[PDB]
Swiss-Prot record:
Modified residues (Phosphothreonine): 8, 30
Keyword hit for Repeat: no
Single GO biological process annotation from the record: response to insulin
Protein name: Fatty acid-binding protein, heart
Amino-acid positions noted as binding (9Z)-octadecenoate in the UniProt annotation, renumbered to this chain: 127-129
Organism field: Homo sapiens (Human)
InterPro entries linked: Calycin, Fatty_acid-bd, ILBP, Lipocln_cytosolic_FA-bd_dom
Organism taxonomic ancestry: Eukaryota, Metazoa, Chordata, Craniata, Vertebrata
Function description: FABPs are thought to play a role in the intracellular transport of long-chain fatty acids and their acyl-CoA esters.
Record gene name: FABP3
């Protein structure tokens, strides 16, 4: 069900990421570096367990999870959140909850590109990833 998401992906477009980061309270110097960074995202499975790596010259993260099972996560901007990832309409939907706040990280495949939509508050960011061979 998740298999078309698997592989190595590189950032090739970003819209409103500064808005999203600012909404989360990320400081200006971090936003400045992140606005110029192009991460590589690696999505792998082993049975029921997905691992999602995000690599860059600035921040690195890695999470492992089972779809539909809550997990603790510490985000790239150091939020300690309760997370769940599911498939919904063919999209990989990652919901993070902390302190009564929520953010969603929604991934969908359009014409072979991975579109990541990040929503927090009113901020909506769209980042496009292309597959590496
Ligand atoms: C410290 C920089 C901001 C991190 C905000 C939360 C994670 C964003 C992930 C974006 C992406 O995977 O393209």
């Amino acid at each position: 069900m998740v298999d078309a998401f698997l592989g190595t992906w590189k950032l090739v477009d970003s819209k409103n990421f500064d808005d999203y980061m600012k909404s989360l309270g990320v400081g200006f110097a971090t936003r400045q570096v992140a606005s110029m960074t192009k991460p590589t995202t690696i999505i792998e499975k082993n049975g029921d367990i997905l691992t999602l790596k995000t690599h860059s010259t600035f921040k690195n993260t890695e999470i492992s999870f089972k779809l539909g099972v809550e997990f603790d996560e510490t985000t790239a901007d150091d939020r300690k959140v309760k997370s769940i990832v599911t498939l919904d309409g063919g999209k990989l939907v990652h919901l993070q909850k902390w302190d009564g706040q929520e953010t969603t990280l929604v991934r969908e495949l359009i014409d072979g590109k991975l579109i990541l939509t990040l929503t927090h508050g009113t901020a909506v960011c769209t980042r496009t990833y292309e597959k590496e061979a």
